[PDB]
Amino acid sequence: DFFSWRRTMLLRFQRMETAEEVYHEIELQAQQLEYDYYSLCVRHPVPFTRPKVAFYTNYPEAWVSYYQAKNFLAIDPVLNPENFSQGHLMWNDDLFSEAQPLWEAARAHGLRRGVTQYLMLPNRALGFLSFSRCSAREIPILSDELQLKMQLLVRESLMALMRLNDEIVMTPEMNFSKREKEILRWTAEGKTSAEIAMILSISENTVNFHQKNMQKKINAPNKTQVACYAAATGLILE
Amino acid sequence: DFFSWRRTMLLRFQRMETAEEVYHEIELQAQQLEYDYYSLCVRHPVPFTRPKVAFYTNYPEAWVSYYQAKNFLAIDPVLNPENFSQGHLMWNDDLFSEAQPLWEAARAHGLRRGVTQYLMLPNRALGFLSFSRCSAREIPILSDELQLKMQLLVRESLMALMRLNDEIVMTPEMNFSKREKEILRWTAEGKTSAEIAMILSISENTVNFHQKNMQKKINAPNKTQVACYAAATGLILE
Numbered sequence: 001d002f003f004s005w006r007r008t009m010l011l012r013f014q015r016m017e018t019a020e021e022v023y024h025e026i027e028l029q030a031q032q033l034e035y036d037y038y039s040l041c042v043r044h045p046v047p048f049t050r051p052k053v054a055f056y057t058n059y060p061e062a063w064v065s066y067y068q069a070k071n072f073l074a075i076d077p078v079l080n081p082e083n084f085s086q087g088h089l090m091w092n093d094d095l096f097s098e099a100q101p102l103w104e105a106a107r108a109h110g111l112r113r114g115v116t117q118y119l120m121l122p123n124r125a126l127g128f129l130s131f132s133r134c135s136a137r138e139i140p141i142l143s144d145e146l147q148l149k150m151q152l153l154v155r156e157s158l159m160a161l162m163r164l165n166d167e168i169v170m171t172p173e174m175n176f177s178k179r180e181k182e183i184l185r186w187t188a189e190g191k192t193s194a195e196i197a198m199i200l201s202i203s204e205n206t207v208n209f210h211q212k213n214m215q216k217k218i219n220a221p222n223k224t225q226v227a228c229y230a231a232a233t234g235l236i237l238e
Numbered sequence: 239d240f241f242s243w244r245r246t247m248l249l250r251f252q253r254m255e256t257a258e259e260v261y262h263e264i265e266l267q268a269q270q271l272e273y274d275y276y277s278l279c280v281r282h283p284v285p286f287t288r289p290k291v292a293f294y295t296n297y298p299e300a301w302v303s304y305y306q307a308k309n310f311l312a313i314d315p316v317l318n319p320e321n322f323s324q325g326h327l328m329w330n331d332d333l334f335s336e337a338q339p340l341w342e343a344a345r346a347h348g349l350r351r352g353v354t355q356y357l358m359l360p361n362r363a364l365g366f367l368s369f370s371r372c373s374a375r376e377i378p379i380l381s382d383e384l385q386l387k388m389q390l391l392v393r394e395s396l397m398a399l400m401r402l403n404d405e406i407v408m409t410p411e412m413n414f415s416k417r418e419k420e421i422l423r424w425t426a427e428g429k430t431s432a433e434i435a436m437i438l439s440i441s442e443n444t445v446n447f448h449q450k451n452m453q454k455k456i457n458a459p460n461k462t463q464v465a466c467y468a469a470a471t472g473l474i475l476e
Contacts, residue, residue, distance in 0.1 A: 002240065003382045010324070048423040048474060086248070122358065124472075144241045185286040188470075190463030224462040225428030231470040232426075234362075236286060 002145070006152060013156035019166045022157050023056050026129070029153055033146065034139050035131035037111065040157060041079060042168055045124040045232045054168040057130075063109040067102075075099040078116045079128055087154075088147045089116050091132070112136050117150035121158055123171045123233050129154035171233040174218060183210050184236055188227040240383070244390060251394035257404045260395050261294050264367070267391055271384065272377050273369035275349065278395060279317060280406055283362040283470045292406040295368075301347040305340075313337040316354045317366055325392075326385045327354050329370070350374050355388035359396055361409045361471050367392035409471040412456060421448050422474055426465040 016022055023040070030038040037059050044052035053073060057064065067073075077083050077095050089095075091114035096103035114132030121127055129150060133139075161169045176184070186196045193211075197204045214226045230236035254260055261278070268276040275297050282290035291311060295302065305311075315321050315333050327333075329352035334341035352370030359365055367388060371377075399407045414422070424434045431449075435442045452464045468474035 188466035190459040221428040228426035
C-alpha cells in the first residue's frame, strides 16, 4: 500500500542528521526500484548569468568526468523542465535527438535506462532526481507508482538537504534585517533613495548606508544586484 | 483506488476551456469530500511592496465583503505557508490564536470546519485551495487521502488557470526578446551599461535603448524595477 510507504518515508527523511544519510537513502530507494544509479542535481537561480549547478551522484566517476569535460550539461534534455509532465520524465531515444553525443556517451559508460523527477524548491532552485540502470532488461513497474514515489523522494531528500544547510541546495545567504529587506523591496519597486527616505522617515544617508551594508555582506557591486538576488531567491518578501 | 482518481482528474483538468469550468470542478470536488465551500486564493510575488491577491471562491458573498472590510488577509493563518506541513493545513482552534477576530467572524458566517492546501507555482505565485464546511459534524476521512487529493486539485486547477491565462494567476507580462533578457541578466548580475556594451559588442546607446524599451513595455521607472520583476517571476533566466 502506497500510503504507509509514504508515511514511512516522510519520517525517515525527517530524522536524518547528515547529507551522507540522505544520499545513502536515495541510493537504497533506487535499488528497491531496481535502478543502479541515482543523481541529485540542483540548478540554482543564481548567478543569473551562469547558474550554480551542484550535484551528488553515485554515477561511475569516469562518467562524471567525461560528462563535464564535454560540457553535456548544456544539452542534457533530462535536466530541462520543458520536457517533463507532472514533474516526471522517462528516458527514451527521441528525448535525446537534440543531444546525440550525450546519448552515445551515456550508453558507452553503461547508463542504458533511466528516469528523472524534478521539483522547484522554496528558494527557486530546480532539483532533479535521476535513476538509471545497466540493463536494457524489461522491469514492469506501474507508471503511476514510480512517479508518485519519485515525487516524494526528490522532494524529501532536497528538503532534508535544506534543513541540513547542505552546499548543494543553499543559495547565497542574505542575513538581512527587517529594515534592510524593507529598503530592498522599495528598491525592487523602482524607488530612489530620496523616495525611500520620504517613505520611511529616515535620511537619504541612512538609506544609502543600509544599501552599502547589504552590498558588503554579499559582496555585490550595487543595490540592483542585491535586490535581484533577494527577489530571485525569495529572500525579499515580508 | 487513488491511482485512477488521479488519472481521471489529470485528464479532466487537461481538457478544460474556461476558468468557470475549473471553478465548477473544484466546487464539485469539494462536495465529493463533503465540504460546502472552496476558495482559490493566489498571492503574487509582485508588487513586492503590496503583493497582488486574487481569488475565486463560492464563500457567502457577505463573508467575502466582511473579510475584506476588516482586512483579515493580513492575519489569515490559513494563507501563511509557515503553518503548513507537506503543503497541507487542517483548520483547528490553536491555528487562530494570533487571529481571534477572524475566527469568530468566520464562524459567525458559518465557516465551521476547514482545510487548505498550498503550492508555489512556476511563476512564484503561491496558490491556496481552501475547503470549508457548515457543520461541526464529524466526517471520518483518511488524513492521507484528503491530502493527496487536494495536492492534485490545487495544482491542476492552478495549472489550468495558467494554461488559460486567467487574471487570477498571471504575473505582469514581460514579452521580451532574447537580447532584452540577456541585457537584463547582466543587469541583475550588477553590470553597468558600459560593461554590458563591452560584454555584448554593441554600443552603450543600444544597451540603454533596450533598457528604456523594457521600461516602456512594463511601465517601470528604471532598469532595476524591470530586472527585479523578471528575477522574481522567473522571466529572467535562459
